[PDB]
Write an enzyme that holds these catalytic residues in place. Structure first.
Site, PDB file in Angstrom:
ATOM      1  CG  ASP A   1      51.482  24.794   2.141  1.00  0.00           C
ATOM      2  OD1 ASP A   1      52.482  24.366   1.515  1.00  0.00           O
ATOM      3  OD2 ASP A   1      50.472  24.104   2.401  1.00  0.00           O
TER       4      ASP A   1
ATOM      5  CD  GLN B   1      48.362  17.506   3.676  1.00  0.00           C
ATOM      6  OE1 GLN B   1      49.048  16.836   2.899  1.00  0.00           O
ATOM      7  NE2 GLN B   1      47.040  17.379   3.744  1.00  0.00           N
TER       8      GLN B   1
ATOM      9  CG  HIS C   1      73.696  31.349  18.810  1.00  0.00           C
ATOM     10  ND1 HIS C   1      74.879  31.119  19.489  1.00  0.00           N
ATOM     11  CD2 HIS C   1      73.980  32.380  17.979  1.00  0.00           C
ATOM     12  CE1 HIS C   1      75.806  31.979  19.104  1.00  0.00           C
ATOM     13  NE2 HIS C   1      75.282  32.767  18.184  1.00  0.00           N
ATOM     14  CD  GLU C   2      72.000  33.132  14.861  1.00  0.00           C
ATOM     15  OE1 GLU C   2      72.222  34.288  15.248  1.00  0.00           O
ATOM     16  OE2 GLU C   2      72.897  32.407  14.372  1.00  0.00           O
TER      17      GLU C   2
ATOM     18  CG  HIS D   1      72.928  37.094  18.958  1.00  0.00           C
ATOM     19  ND1 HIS D   1      74.026  37.362  19.740  1.00  0.00           N
ATOM     20  CD2 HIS D   1      73.315  36.134  18.083  1.00  0.00           C
ATOM     21  CE1 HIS D   1      75.036  36.595  19.373  1.00  0.00           C
ATOM     22  NE2 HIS D   1      74.631  35.839  18.367  1.00  0.00           N
TER      23      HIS D   1
ATOM     24  CE1 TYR E   1      78.232  38.996  18.547  1.00  0.00           C
ATOM     25  CE2 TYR E   1      79.239  39.513  16.435  1.00  0.00           C
ATOM     26  CZ  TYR E   1      78.748  38.587  17.334  1.00  0.00           C
ATOM     27  OH  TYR E   1      78.757  37.241  17.042  1.00  0.00           O
TER      28      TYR E   1
ATOM     29  CD  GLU F   1      78.465  34.697  18.838  1.00  0.00           C
ATOM     30  OE1 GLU F   1      78.500  33.451  18.869  1.00  0.00           O
ATOM     31  OE2 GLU F   1      77.592  35.309  18.195  1.00  0.00           O
TER      32      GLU F   1
ATOM     33  CD  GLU G   1      71.139  20.638  21.247  1.00  0.00           C
ATOM     34  OE1 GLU G   1      71.421  21.559  20.442  1.00  0.00           O
ATOM     35  OE2 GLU G   1      71.891  19.646  21.445  1.00  0.00           O
TER      36      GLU G   1
ATOM     37  CG  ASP H   1      85.062  36.130  15.196  1.00  0.00           C
ATOM     38  OD1 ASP H   1      83.942  36.425  14.725  1.00  0.00           O
ATOM     39  OD2 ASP H   1      85.173  35.291  16.116  1.00  0.00           O
TER      40      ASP H   1
ATOM     41  CG  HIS I   1      81.790  33.789  16.328  1.00  0.00           C
ATOM     42  ND1 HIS I   1      81.816  34.943  15.571  1.00  0.00           N
ATOM     43  CD2 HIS I   1      80.494  33.441  16.440  1.00  0.00           C
ATOM     44  CE1 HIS I   1      80.583  35.278  15.232  1.00  0.00           C
ATOM     45  NE2 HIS I   1      79.757  34.372  15.746  1.00  0.00           N
TER      46      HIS I   1
HETATM   47 CA    CA Z   1      73.903  21.255  20.381  1.00  0.00          CA
HETATM   48 CA    CA Z   2      51.616  22.243   1.175  1.00  0.00          CA
HETATM   49 CA    CA Z   3      72.186  17.922  19.974  1.00  0.00          CA
HETATM   50 CU   CU1 Z   4      75.930  34.536  17.445  1.00  0.00          CU
END
Ligand code: CA
Ligand code: CA
Ligand code: CA
Ligand code: CU1
Ligand code: CA
EC number: 3.4.24.27
Length: 316
Positions: free
Chosen positions: A57, A61, A142-143, A146, A157, A166, A177, A226, A231
């Site tokens: 960039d 910004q 989450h990712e 893994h 998996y 999972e 979070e 799955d 999942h």
């Molecule tokens: Ca959440």
């Molecule tokens: Ca920019």
């Molecule tokens: Ca939330």
């Molecule tokens: Cu996952």
């Protein structure tokens, strides 16, 4: 890139303003040198060749629409780093400050995000089922979890080991979070799922059945879709994790909750010290029980609640 560390500013997917660590060398790059061997965010440019180009960039910004998924992938990768380091004394996903790489704008209308063995990948969503998936901190964490699992327990998996894989990602995704403390819940993906519909989510830990996932072993899926329901059957473990932390009574079995930090301590320990690539649900119970024993003593409340929660979801 070789360059000097700077701080840029921009808006994320949900329109929130945030500062981001960048690297200046002619352009400002999404390269955060303040965390381990770096956090690097790339543009896949609506294509599927990975990782694409290191995000560049001109003015540091990042408030364009196109910028928002990158800002959040970058920023939330840093929040997750901070969680693992500050809460579990773990340095990046391999425990040795591996560089964390993320690509956004993957493909077109792609309703998913994943760890591909090397790096994180985020679709933009089709705008209906999903908006850019890096907008959800639980999705990002989450990712990245893994990767942590892959470098530790190595849960395969598929079948029960994959459903445990999972749930672990759902569990720490949710703990990150809460750590960031921004509208935290025990739902997965609510900040980026179905923008036209409020109050729903991808999955629920506190009541998996609200989206058709099982909340007891007796309801496990035994088919082969799955990958054997990774999942789907994750709901059974997600529910137990929820009860361990928050307590409650499920199918008549009462669980004394012991809170999120101890949940995270017990499951972190189990993940890094006791689970193995082919651990099943029953072996997870044993690992979590021994982890709690290790941590709080054989006769602790903590141990009792882990036992209660696994009882509540039918796994012995
Ligand atoms: Ca959440
Ligand atoms: Ca920019
Ligand atoms: Ca939330
Ligand atoms: Cu996952
Ligand atoms: Ca929604």
């Amino acid at each position: 890139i070789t360059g000097t560390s700077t701080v840029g500013v921009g808006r994320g997917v949900l329109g929130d303003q945030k500062n981001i660590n960048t690297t200046y060398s002619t352009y400002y790059y999404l390269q955060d040198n303040t965390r381990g061997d770096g956090i690097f965010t790339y543009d896949a440019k609506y294509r599927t060749t990975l990782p694409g180009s290191l995000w560049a960039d001109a003015d540091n910004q990042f408030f364009a629409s196109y910028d928002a998924p990158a800002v959040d992938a970058h920023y939330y990768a840093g929040v997750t780093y901070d969680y693992y380091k500050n809460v579990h004394n773990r340095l990046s996903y391999d425990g040795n400050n591996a560089a964390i790489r993320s690509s956004v704008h993957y493909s077109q209308g792609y309703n998913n995000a994943f760890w591909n063995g090397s790096e994180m990948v985020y679709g933009d969503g089709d705008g209906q089922t999903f908006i850019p998936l890096s907008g959800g901190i639980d999705v990002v964490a989450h990712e990245l979890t893994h990767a942590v699992t892959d470098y530790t327990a190595g849960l395969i998996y598929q079948n029960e080991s994959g459903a445990i894989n999972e749930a672990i990602s759902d569990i720490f995704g949710t703990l990150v979070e809460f750590y960031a403390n921004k509208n935290p819940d025990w739902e997965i993906g609510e900040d980026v799922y179905t923008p036209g519909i409020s109050g729903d989510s991808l999955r629920s830990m506190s009541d998996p059945a609200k989206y058709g996932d099982p909340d007891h072993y007796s309801k496990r899926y035994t088919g082969t879709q799955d990958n054997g329901g990774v999942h789907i059957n994750s709901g059974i473990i997600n529910k137990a994790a929820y009860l361990i932390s928050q307590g409650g009574t499920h199918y008549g079995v009462s669980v004394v909750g012991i809170g999120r930090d101890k949940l995270g301590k017990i499951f972190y320990r189990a993940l890094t010290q006791y689970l193995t690539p082919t651990s099943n649900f029953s072996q997870l119970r044993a690992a979590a029980v021994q982890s709690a024993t290790d941590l709080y003593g054989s006769t602790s409340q903590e141990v009792a609640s882990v036992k209660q929660a696994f009882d509540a979801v039918g796994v012995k």
